[PDB]
Amino acid sequence: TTALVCDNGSGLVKAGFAGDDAPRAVFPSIVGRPRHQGVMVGMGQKDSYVGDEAQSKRGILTLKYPIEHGIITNWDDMEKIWHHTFYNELRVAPEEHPTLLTEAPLNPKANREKMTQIMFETFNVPAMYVAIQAVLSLYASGRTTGIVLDSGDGVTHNVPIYEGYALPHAIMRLDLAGRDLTDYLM
């Protein structure tokens, strides 16, 4: 068999097997729901919408945003997102691969514990891991030492990494990411 990785670095969400050059496709992690009485009786009512489907559908939908400050706000919504992503894009079953999780560093245990709890229970999945952004950033950039700045959709980072080790005291973590900037924009 084969091994599969979810990116849950915030913004559009990235998922792909080991060894593909780039993830198959990517989704905002918008979540949105209806705003108005449903008045085409012909329409099937679906009460929650996600992804480019929503990105099209947006106007009467209204958004919820399931990650604040890199902290994922509402678990069951995530579960909706996650399920959708597997089945609709990936055509994948939880047994199929080990799965790898992508985490803001230095943030509350709860995200660890519930994430794992859900994904081992709700999905049933051979192997699990959660990994800190900077490590990946080095591996891709291929210099065993370094310091990384990556200010995504979500909380904004400084980590020096020396070759082969962490300096967790060294590390700085900031909620300055582009979303809040954008809301300043208005």
Place this chain on the structure above:
Amino acid sequence: XXXXXXXXXXXXXXXXXXXXXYXXXXXXXXXXXXXXXXXXXXXXXXXXXXXXX
């Protein structure tokens, strides 16, 4: 010399022709007892609110 069919029919007709009386009687009287419900349209409001904040 009289009060007659002719005059009574005149009155009848005028009655029929007077729109103001009959329309006012129906619409204005019926306008007052207009409304009682916990609207489902407002159910939408409440649900949205739930989703809102």
